[PDB]
Design a protein around this ligand. Structure first.
Ligand SMILES: CCCCCCCCCCCCCCCCCC(=O)OCC(COC(=O)CCCCCCCCCCCCCCCCC)OC(=O)CCCCCCCCCCCCCCCCC
Ligand code: HEA
Ligand code: HEA
Ligand SMILES: CCCCCCCCCCCCCCCCCC(=O)OC[C@H](COP(=O)([O-])OCC[N+](C)(C)C)OC(=O)CCCCCCCCCCCCCCCCC
Ligand SMILES: CCCCCCCCCCCCCCCCCC(=O)OC[C@H](COP(=O)(O)OCCN)OC(=O)CCCCCCCCCCCCCCCCC
Ligand SMILES: CCCCCCCCCCCCCCCCCC(=O)OC[C@H](COP(=O)(O)OCCN)OC(=O)CCCCCCCCCCCCCCCCC
Ligand SMILES: CCCCCCCCCCCCCCCCCC(=O)OC[C@H](COP(=O)(O)OCCN)OC(=O)CCCCCCCCCCCCCCCCC
Ligand SMILES: CCCCCCCCCCCCCCCCCC(=O)OC[C@H](COP(=O)(O)OCCN)OC(=O)CCCCCCCCCCCCCCCCC
Ligand SMILES: CCCCCCCCCCCCCCCCCC(=O)OC[C@H](COP(=O)(O)OCCN)OC(=O)CCCCCCCCCCCCCCCCC
Ligand SMILES: CCCCCCCCCCCCCCCCCC(=O)OC[C@H](COP(=O)(O)OCCN)OC(=O)CCCCCCCCCCCCCCCCC
Ligand code: CUA
Ligand SMILES: [Cu+2]
Ligand code: NA
Ligand SMILES: [Zn+2]
Lengths: 43, 514, 144, 104, 227, 46, 72, 47, 49
C-alpha cells in the first residue's frame, strides 16, 4: 500500500513528546496505586 | 447528526468501527489485569494479601480478554467491515440486530465490572464451577452479575451469528456459489454456525447455576441429589466450541494476509482450507471431556476423547501445511502484517504441539491444572489470536482509517511484542513440568526464578502495546493517504477506495454463470 | 494537485517485480521535447543516443529492477528501537523493585537456604537424576 | 503439455501481426509467473513485438526481467544475451547493463 | 519435589511416573521433530529469490500430507493408550486411606481396623522450624508403607479440591458427593510434597500434602502410637 | 448526509493532532486505570 | 569459449527437492540429538539407580538424622 | 447495464475457479478482463 | 541520496545495544533481585537439628 506524502508531517521532537505523554499518562495512575499497597492495608 | 450516525447506526462499517474501539478499550483493561497478575507473581510473598482478590483479578482477566477483546474486535469488527465488502453486499441482512448486539456488549461489560465490585467478588476462575460459585462459598451478588454478563454476551453473539449466516448465505450475487467466496467469509460462516450451536448450552448451564444460587434448586449440589460433573459437562460442551470460535477467524485473517503479501492470486488448496475449517468446526463438538481427564471418568471414555483429539489435530495440520505451500515461490513482501502472520504460524504451531502433549490423558493426569496448560493456551490465545488480530489490524488500517501506518514503528512493535511474550510464556512450560499449579498467589521458593523471568517479560509486552498506541496516533499525526493499492482486482474490499464511502454497492456487482 | 474522489477506479502505475510491464505509464502528460522523442520513436532505434534512451525509459517507468531490489537499511533501525524500549522496560522493572515490592520472605538468606538444602539432600529429594544425585554421599561434597 | 507446444504457442502468440500493447503486456506479465526462465526465441518474438508496435522501454524491462528471472546463479543472463546479440544490433535495442540501469 | 532451575519433571518414585516420564520424553522428541520441520521449512522457503506465482496443480501432494501426520499421531496414540490402560487394572491393595478435603485443610482416615483420623494443616511461615520448606510443610505428615499397593479414596465435604502429589504421579479430583479411586505405591522411602490443584477459595495456595513413606514395621509402630 | 473521506468516517475529530493525542491517552489510560482502582477499592473494603 | 546452455526450467522445484531432503535429515537429526542427549541417559540412569538399590539401608540413613515423624 | 458512469464487473472466466476477479468498467468502448480478455461493454440507461 | 536509515541505523544499533545491555546488567545484578540460584556446588550444607 503506497502512500501520500504527509499533509501535516510530524517533527521528531513532537513524536518524542507524544510517546512521553503516552508513557506518563499510563504510568501515573497505575504507578501511583502501586506506589503504596501497604497504605491500603490499614497502616 | 452524531446520535443518528453512531448511536442509531444501521450500516455495517460504523458498527465495525465501534466494535474496534470497544475492543481496544477492553483489551487495555485486560492487559492491566495481566500486569496485576504478573505483578503479584514477580516476587515471593503476598503483594495483595489473600488469594481472593488475586482470584478476582484472574477471573476478570480471563473474562475481559475472552468475551470483550478477541470476540468483539475479531468477529464483530472484522466481519462487519469486511463480510459485506468481500461478498459485494450493500449492507448486512439485519443491521438493526447488528447494532443491538454491539450496544448489548457494554451493558455486559458494566455488569462484569460491577461483579468485581460487590463485597465478595467472583473469584472462581472463568470456569464458574459449583459449589465454589454457590451461595455458600460466594454468598453475594458477584457470581449472579457475572452470570448475567455472560448471558448478555451470549445473546449478543447469537444475534451476530444469525445476522452473519443469513448475510453470507443469502446476500451473495446470484451467480456466485458458496465455494467462490473468500476464506475469511468461510471462517465467519463456520464461526457463526458454531456460535449459535454452542452458546445456548452455556446459557442453560448458567441459568441452572443461577437457579441453584437463588431459587433453591439442587441441580449441582449433591446434598439434594445434584452433581457438579453435570455442570462441567455442559460448560465444556460449550467451551471447546468457544475455543474454536476464538481461533477460526484468525485462520481466515492469516490466510488472507499471507495470500496478499506473498503475491499469490489464490491460497494453495482452497478446497483443503474449506474442508479443514469444516472439519475443525464439526469436530470441536466431540472433544470437550479432554478438559475433564482427572474428574474420575471411565477409562474407555477418556480413551475415546484422546483419540478424537488426535482426529481434530490432523486437519489444522492440513491448514498449516497449506499456508506453507502458499508461501512457496511468491514475491515475499516483508510488510509488518507479514511478520505478524509468520509469528502466528510458528507460535501457533508450538501451542498446538503443547496441546498435543496435553492430549494424552496420562500426561494430562500429571499436568492438569498446572502452568503447562497455561503456556499451551497462551501460546495459542495470547500469541496466535493476538498476532492474527494485529496482522488484520495492520493490514486493514489503510482501509478503515484511510491513512497508512509507519512501517518502521510497526516492525519495532512486532519485535518488542515477540521478545516480550516469548520470554513471558516460555518459562511457564518449566513451571508446569516442575509442578506449580494454577490459581496460586504464592508459590514455594523453587518456582521463584522462572516466575521472576516470566514477570518481567510481561512488562516488555506492556511496552509493546504502549508503542502500539503511538502507532495509531502517528497515523493521525501524519495524515498520509493512499495512492492506490496493489492486487485490488482480486480483493473486493480494496476496490472502492480507502476508506470506502457510506453507500457502497448501490449498483451491485456483475458476475455471470452463463 | 488534488484529484476527485475516483482515484480508486482507474488503474495506477505500480512498481513490482511480479508485474514487470505495468498497465499505466509513469508520466502521463508529456512536454514538447518528449513529443519530439515520441515522434522519433516511429523511426529506427539505430540513430538513438544514450540520453534519449535513458530519459524515455524514465518516462515510461520510474524505477528499474536494480533500483527497487536494493538493500535498504531498516532492520538495524528496527532492532535498535527494540533495544531502546526493552531498556526502558528494565527501567520500569527497576522502579517496581525499588518502590512497589516489599521485603522478601525470610527463607531466602544464606543460613536458611544452607540448612534447607542440607535437609533437602538429607531426605534425598529426587535422588535419581535431579538434585540429590548431584551430591557425593561419601566425600560430603558436590559431584565434580 | 510438454516443452515444444508451450514454446511454439508463445512464439506464435508474440508474433501476432496485429498485436497491440495490452495483450503484449498480458503475455509478458503472465510469462514471468511460471517456474521457468523464458526461452530465448520467446524473448526474440517479444522484442520484435515491442519493435512492431513502436515502443522501446518495455523491451528494456523485458531484458531486465530476463536478468532477474534467473535468480541467484548468473550463468543464465550472459548466455541469453550472447544468443540475443544479432537481434540486439539489428533493432538498435540496448542492454540494461550498458544503459546504466543495472548500476544501483 | 521441585528444586531451583528445574526444567523437566520431578523424578519418579511410583512405576507409573516412570512410564509416563518415558512417554513424555517420547512425545517431546516428536514435538521437537515437528517444530524443527516447520521452522526449517519456513526459514528455507522465505529466503529464496526465485518466484512462481501462476496456476499450480491443486491436488498432487495432499495424500502424503494427510497420511504422514496420521502415522505420527497413531505413533503418539498407541503408547498413550497402552499406559492409559495401566492405571485401573486389578490391584488387590494392602491399605485403604480415606482423604476428605475440608475448607482449606485435609483430613485422613485409616479405618480398615482401629479407626484413626487426623487433620493436616500447613505449618505457618513464621512458625517454621529451621531448615523446613516454605508453603509445603504440614502439621501431621501422612504416613504410608513402602512398595505396596495402597487403595486411596478421595473426596471433599463442601467444594471442589484436587489431591495431587506429582512425584508419585497422582492427581485426583475431590468432589463432594463422590468417591474417587487412586492406587498409590512407592519404591523409595521419604517425603513427597504435593498441593491442591483445583480452585477452592481464598486460601487455595495454602493446603499442602506431605506423604511420608516408611517400612511396614515402622508403619505398624506409627499406627499403634498414633491411636 | 454524513461526511465522506479520510478522517471523517470516525466518531472523533482527527483534525487536531494534540487534542487527539490527549483524547487517546485519556481514553486508553482510563481503560488501563480501571482495574487498578478496582483493586484499590477491594483492598480498602477489607 | 562461449557459454553452454544451462538449466532454464524447474529451478525452484529442484531447490525444493534437495532441501526437502535436507529438511528431513536435519529434523530427524535434531530429534535424535534430543533423544541420545536426554532420553537414553535418563533411562540408563534409572537402570543404574534401581539395579543395585537397597531400601533398608536407604531408610536407615534417612532416619539417622531425624526426618520422619514415625521413626525416632 | 448501469445507472452511473461505472460498475464493478466480476469475472469467472474459466469454470470451476475459486476467485472471481473484479474490475471497474467505465463508459466508452469495451474494456476486457485483465487475465482472460473477454470483452465487457457498459450501456448505462436502465432504471 | 543519503536517507535516514543509511547512517542512523548504525547509530541506533550502537545506542540500543549499549543501552539495553547496560540497564539489563544493572537490573539483573545491582538492584538486589534474589534470583534463587541453583545450590549445586555453591552453598555448603549446614547442620540442622
Ligand atoms: C465535540 C467534541 C469533539 C468531537 C467529539 C470527539 C471526542 C468525544 C467523542 O465522542 O469521541 C468519540 C468516542 C467514540 O466512542 C464511542 O462512540 C463509543 C465507545 C464505546 C466504548 C465503551 C467502553 C466501555 C464502557 C462501559 C464500561 O471516542 C472516545 O470516547 C475516545 C476515542 C479515542 C480514540 C480511540 C482510537 C482507537 C484506535 C484503535 C481503533 C481504530 C479503529 C479505526 C476504524
Ligand atoms: C486459542 C484457543 C485455543 C486453541 C486453538 C486450543 C487448541 C487445542 N487445545 Fe486447548 N485450551 C484453551 C484454548 C485453546 N486450545 C484454553 C483457553 C484452555 C484452558 C481451559 C481450562 O482452564 O481448563 C485449554 C485447555 C486445553 C486442555 C486442558 C488441559 C488440562 O488442563 O487438563 C487440553 C488437553 O487436551 C487442550 C488441548 C488442545 C488441543 C489438543 C488443541 C488443538 O486444537 C491444537 C491444534 C493442533 C495443532 C495446531 C498441531 C499442529 C499440527 C501440525 C503442525 C501437523 C503435524 C502434527 C503431527 C505430525 C502430530 N486445551
Ligand atoms: C484472550 C485471552 C487471553 C490473552 C490475550 C491473555 C494474555 C495474557 N495472559 Fe492470560 N489468561 C487467559 C486468557 C488470556 N490471557 C485465560 C482464559 C486464563 C485462565 C484464567 C483462569 O485461571 O481461570 C489466563 C490466565 C493467565 C494467568 C494465570 C494466573 C493464575 O492462574 O495464577 C496468567 C499469569 O501468568 C496470565 C498472563 C497473561 C499475560 C502475562 C498476557 C499477555 O499476553 C498480555 C498481553 C496482551 C495484550 C497486550 C492484548 C493484545 C491487544 C493489543 C495488543 C491491542 C489490541 C487493540 C487493537 C488492535 C486496536 N494469564
Ligand atoms: C490395552 C492395550 C491398548 C489398546 C488400544 C486400543 C484402545 C481403543 C479404545 C477406544 C475407546 C473405545 C471405547 O470404549 O470408547 C468408549 C466411548 C464412550 O463414549 P460416550 O459416548 O459414553 O461418552 C459419554 C461419557 N459419559 C458417559 C461419561 C458422559 O465410545 C465412544 O465414544 C464411541 C465408540 C468408540 C470410539 C473409539 C474410537 C475413537 C476415535 C473415533 C471417534 C469417531
Ligand atoms: C525517541 C522516539 C521518537 C523518535 C522520533 C524520530 O527519530 O523520528 C524520525 C523517524 C521518522 O521516520 P523517518 O525515518 O523520517 O521516515 C519514515 C521512513 N519510511 O523515526 C523513525 O524512523 C523511527 C526511529 C526512531 C528511533 C528512536
Ligand atoms: C432478544 C432480542 C430479540 C431481537 C429481535 O427479536 O429482533 C427481531 C428482528 C428485527 O427485525 P430486523 O430484521 O432486524 O429488521 C431489519 C431489517 N428488516 O427480526 C429479525 O431479524 C427476524 C427474526 C429474528 C428473530 C431473532 C430472535 C432472537
Ligand atoms: C527476536 C525478535 C526478532 C524480530 C525481527 C524483526 C525484523 C524486522 C526487520 C525486517 O524484517 O526488515 C525487513 C527486511 C527486508 O526488507 P526489504 O528491503 O523488503 O528486503 C528486500 C531486499 N532488498 O529484512 C528481512 O525481512 C530479513 C529477515 C528478518 C526478519 C524475519 C522475520 C520472520 C518472522
Ligand atoms: C519450542 C519447543 C517446544 C516446546 C517445549 C516445551 C517443553 C519443554 O521445554 O520441556 C523441557 C525440556 C525437557 O526437560 P529436561 O531436559 O528433561 O529437564 C531435566 C534435565 N534437564 O527441556 C529441554 O528440552 C531442554 C531445555 C529447553 C530447550 C528448548
Ligand atoms: C476530549 C479530550 C479530553 C481533553 C480535552 C482537551 C481539549 C484541548 C486541549 C488539548 C489540545 C491543545 O490545545 O493543545 C495545545 C496546543 C498548543 O499548540 P502547539 O502544539 O504549540 O502548536 C503546534 C506547534 N508545535 O494547541 C493546538 O495544537 C491547537 C491549535 C492547532 C491549530 C488549530 C487551527 C484551527 C483552525 C480552525
Ligand atoms: C531404528 C528404528 C527406529 O525406531 O529408529 C528410531 C528413529 C527413527 O524411528 P522413529 O522413532 O519412528 O522416528 C522418530 C519419531 N519421532 O531413528 C533415530 O532416532 C535415528 C538414530 C540414529 C541416527 C542419528 C543421526 C544423527 C545425525 C545428526
Ligand atoms: Cu483445595 Cu485448592
Ligand atoms: Cu479444549
Ligand atoms: Na504473590
Ligand atoms: Zn475473465
Amino acid at each position: 500500500v503506497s502512500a501520500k506524502p504527509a499533509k501535516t508531517p510530524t517533527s521528531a521532537v513532537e513524536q518524542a513528546v507524544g510517546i512521553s505523554a503516552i508513557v506518563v499518562g499510563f504510568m501515573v495512575p497505575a504507578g501511583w496505586v502501586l506506589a503504596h499497597l501497604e497504605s491500603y492495608k490499614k497502616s | 447528526m452524531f446520535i443518528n450516525r453512531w448511536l442509531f447506526s444501521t450500516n455495517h462499517k460504523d458498527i465495525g468501527t465501534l466494535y474496534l474501539l470497544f475492543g481496544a478499550w477492553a483489551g487495555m483493561v485486560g492487559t492491566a489485569l495481566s500486569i496485576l497478575i504478573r505483578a503479584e507473581l514477580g516476587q515471593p510473598g503476598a503483594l495483595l494479601g489473600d488469594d481472593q482478590i488475586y482470584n478476582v483479578i484472574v477471573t476478570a482477566h480471563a473474562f475481559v480478554m475472552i468475551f470483550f477483546m478477541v470476540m468483539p474486535m475479531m468477529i464483530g469488527g472484522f466481519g462487519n467491515w469486511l463480510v459485506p465488502l468481500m461478498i459485494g453486499a450493500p449492507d448486512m441482512a439485519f443491521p438493526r440486530m447488528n447494532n443491538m448486539s454491539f450496544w448489548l456488549l457494554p451493558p455486559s461489560f458494566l455488569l462484569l465490572l460491577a461483579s468485581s465490585m460487590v463485597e465478595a467478588g467472583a473469584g472462581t476462575g472463568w470456569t464458574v464451577y459449583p459449589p465454589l460459585a454457590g451461595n455458600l462459598a460466594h454468598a453475594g451478588a458477584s457470581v449472579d452479575l457475572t452470570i448475567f454478563s455472560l448471558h448478555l454476551a451470549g445473546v449478543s453473539s447469537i444475534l451476530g451469528a444469525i445476522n452473519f449466516i443469513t448475510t453470507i448465505i443469502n446476500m451473495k450475487p446470484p451467480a456466485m456459489t458458496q465455494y467462490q467466496t473468500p476464506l475469511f467469509v468461510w471462517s465467519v460462516l463456520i464461526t457463526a454456525v458454531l456460535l449459535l450451536l454452542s452458546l445456548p448450552v452455556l446459557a442453560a448451564g448458567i441459568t441452572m447455576l443461577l437457579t441453584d444460587r437463588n431459587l433453591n434448586t439442587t441441580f449441582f449440589d449433591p446434598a439434594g441429589g445434584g452433581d457438579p460433573i453435570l455442570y462441567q459437562h455442559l460448560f465444556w460442551f460449550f467451551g471447546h466450541p468457544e475455543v474454536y470460535i476464538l481461533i477460526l477467524p484468525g485462520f481466515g485473517i492469516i490466510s488472507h494476509v499471507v495470500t496478499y503479501y506473498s503475491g499469490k492470486k489464490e491460497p494453495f488448496g482452497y478446497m483443503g482450507m474449506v474442508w479443514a475449517m469444516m472439519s475443525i468446526g464439526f469436530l470441536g463438538f466431540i472433544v470437550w471431556a479432554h478438559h475433564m481427564f482427572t474428574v474420575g471418568l471411565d477409562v474407555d471414555t477418556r480413551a475415546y476423547f484422546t483419540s478424537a483429539t488426535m482426529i481434530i489435530a490432523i486437519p489444522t495440520g492440513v491448514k498449516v501445511f497449506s499456508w506453507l505451500a502458499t508461501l512457496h515461490g511468491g514475491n515475499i513482501k516483508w510488510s509488518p502484517a507479514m511478520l505478524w502472520a509468520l509469528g502466528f504460524i510458528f507460535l501457533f504451531t508450538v501451542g498446538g504441539l503443547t496441546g498435543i502433549v496435553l492430549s494424552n490423558s496420562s500426561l494430562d493426569i500429571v499436568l492438569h491444572d498446572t502452568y503447562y496448560v497455561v503456556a499451551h493456551f497462551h501460546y495459542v490465545l495470547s500469541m496466535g489470536a493476538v498476532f492474527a488480530i494485529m496482522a488484520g489490524f495492520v493490514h486493514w488500517f489503510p482501509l478503515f482509517s484511510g491513512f497508512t501506518l509507519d512501517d518502521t514503528w510497526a516492525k519495532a512493535h512486532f519485535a518488542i511484542m515477540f521478545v516480550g511474550v516469548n520470554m513471558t510464556f516460555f518459562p511457564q512450560h518449566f513451571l508446569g513440568l516442575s509442578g506449580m499449579p494454577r490459581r496460586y498467589s504464592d508459590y514455594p521458593d523453587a518456582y521463584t526464578t522462572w516466575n521472576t523471568v516470566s514477570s518481567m517479560g510481561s512488562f516488555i509486552s506492556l511496552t509493546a502495546v504502549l508503542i502500539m498506541i503511538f502507532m495509531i496516533w502517528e497515523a493521525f499525526a501524519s495524515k498520509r493517504e493512499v495512492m492506490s493499492v496493489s492486487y485490488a482486482s482480486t480483493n473486493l474490499e480494496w476496490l472502492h477506495g480507502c476508506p470506502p464511502p457510506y453507500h457502497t454497492f448501490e449498483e451491485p456487482t456483475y458476475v455471470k454463470v452463463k | 494537485s488534488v484529484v476527485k474522489s475516483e482515484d480508486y477506479a482507474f488503474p495506477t502505475y505500480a512498481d513490482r517485480r511480479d508485474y514487470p510491464l505495468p498497465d499505466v505509464a509513469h508520466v502521463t502528460m508529456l512536454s514538447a521535447s518528449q513529443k519530439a522523442l515520441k515522434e522519433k520513436e516511429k523511426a529506427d532505434w539505430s540513430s538513438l543516443s544514450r540520453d534519449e534512451k535513458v530519459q524515455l525509459y524514465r518516462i515510461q517507468f520510474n524505477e528499474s529492477f536494480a533500483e527497487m531490489n536494493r538493500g535498504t537499511n531498516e532492520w538495524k533501525t528496527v532492532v535498535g528501537m527494540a533495544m531502546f524500549f526493552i531498556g526502558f522496560t528494565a527501567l520500569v522493572l527497576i522502579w517496581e523493585k525499588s518502590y512497589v515490592y516489599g521485603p522478601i520472605p525470610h527463607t531466602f538468606d544464606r543460613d536458611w537456604v544452607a540448612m534447607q538444602t542440607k535437609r533437602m539432600l538429607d531426605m534425598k529429594a529426587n535422588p535419581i537424576q535431579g538434585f540429590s544425585a548431584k551430591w557425593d554421599y561419601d566425600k560430603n561434597e558436590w559431584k565434580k | 503439455e510438454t516443452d515444444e507446444e508451450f514454446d511454439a504457442r508463445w512464439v506464435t502468440y508474440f508474433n501476432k501481426p496485429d498485436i497491440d500493447a495490452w495483450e503484449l503486456r498480458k503475455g509478458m506479465n503472465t510469462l514471468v509467473g511460471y517456474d521457468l526462465v523464458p526461452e530465448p526465441k520467446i524473448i526474440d518474438a517479444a522484442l520484435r513485438a515491442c519493435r512492431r508496435l513502436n515502443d522501446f522501454a518495455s523491451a528494456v524491462r523485458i531484458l531486465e526481467v530476463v536478468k532477474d528471472k534467473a535468480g541467484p546463479h548468473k550463468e543464465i543472463y550472459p548466455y541469453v544475451i550472447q544468443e540475443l546479440r544479432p537481434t540486439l544490433n539489428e533493432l538498435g535495442i540496448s542492454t540494461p547493463e550498458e544503459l546504466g540501469l543495472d548500476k544501483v | 519435589m521441585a528444586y531451583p532451575f528445574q526444567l523437566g519433571l520431578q523424578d519418579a518414585t511410583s512405576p507409573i511416573m516412570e512410564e509416563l516420564m518415558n512417554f513424555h520424553d517420547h512425545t517431546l522428541m516428536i514435538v521437537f521433530l515437528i517444530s524443527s520441520l516447520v521452522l526449517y521449512i519456513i526459514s528455507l522457503m522465505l529466503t529464496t529469490k526465485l518466484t512462481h506465482t501462476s496456476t499450480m496443480d491443486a491436488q498432487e501432494v495432499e495424500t502424503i500430507w494427510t497420511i504422514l501426520p496420521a502415522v505420527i499421531l497413531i505413533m503418539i496414540a498407541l503408547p498413550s493408550l497402552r499406559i492409559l490402560y495401566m492405571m485401573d487394572e486389578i490391584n488387590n491393595p494392602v491399605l485403604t486411606v480415606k482423604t476428605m478435603g475440608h475448607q482449606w485443610y485435609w483430613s485422613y482416615e485409616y479405618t480398615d481396623y482401629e479407626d484413626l483420623c487426623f487433620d493436616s494443616y500447613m505449618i505457618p511461615t513464621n512458625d517454621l522450624k529451621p531448615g523446613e520448606l516454605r508453603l509445603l510443610e504440614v502439621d501431621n505428615r501422612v504416613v504410608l508403607p513402602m512398595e505396596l499397593p495402597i487403595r486411596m479414596l478421595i473426596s471433599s465435604e463442601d467444594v471442589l479440591h484436587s489431591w495431587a502429589v506429582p512425584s508419585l504421579g497422582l492427581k485426583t479430583d475431590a468432589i463432594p458427593g463422590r468417591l474417587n479411586q487412586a492406587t498409590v505405591t512407592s519404591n523409595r522411602p521419604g517425603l513427597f510434597y504435593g498441593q491442591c490443584s483445583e480452585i477452592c477459595g481464598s486460601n487455595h495456595s495454602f493446603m499442602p500434602i506431605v506423604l511420608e513413606m516408611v517400612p511396614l514395621k515402622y508403619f505398624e509402630n506409627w499406627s499403634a502410637s498414633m491411636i | 448526509h454524513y461526511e465522506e473521506g479520510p478522517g471523517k468516517n470516525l466518531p472523533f475529530s482527527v483534525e487536531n493532532k494534540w487534542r487527539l493525542l490527549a483524547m487517546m491517552t485519556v481514553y486508553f489510560g482510563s481503560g488501563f486505570a480501571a482495574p487498578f482502582f478496582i483493586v484499590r477499592h477491594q483492598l480498602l473494603k477489607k | 569459449a562461449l557459454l553452454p546452455k544451462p538449466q532454464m526450467r524447474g529451478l525452484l522445484a529442484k531447490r525444493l527437492r534437495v532441501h526437502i531432503a535436507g529438511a528431513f535429515i536435519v529434523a530427524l537429526g535434531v530429534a535424535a540429538a534430543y533423544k541420545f542427549g536426554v532420553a537414553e541417559p535418563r533411562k540408563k540412569a534409572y537402570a543404574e539407580f534401581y539395579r543395585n538399590y537397597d531400601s533398608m539401608k536407604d531408610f536407615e540413613e534417612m532416619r539417622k538424622a531425624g526426618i520422619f515423624q514415625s521413626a525416632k | 447495464p448501469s445507472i452511473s458512469n461505472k460498475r464493478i464487473v466480476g469475472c469467472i472466466c474459466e469454470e470451476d475457479n475459486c476467485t472471481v476477479i473484479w474490475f471497474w468498467l467505465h463508459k466508452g468502448e469495451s474494456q476486457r478482463c485483465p487475465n482472460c480478455g473477454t470483452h465487457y461493454k457498459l450501456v448505462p440507461h436502465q432504471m | 541520496a543519503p536517507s535516514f536509515h543509511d547512517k542512523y541505523g548504525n547509530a541506533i544499533l550502537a545506542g540500543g545495544a549499549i543501552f539495553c545491555v547496560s540497564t539489563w546488567t544493572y537490573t539483573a545484578t545491582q538492584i538486589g533481585i534474589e534470583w534463587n540460584m541453583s545450590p549445586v556446588g555453591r552453598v555448603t550444607p549446614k547442620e540442622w537439628r
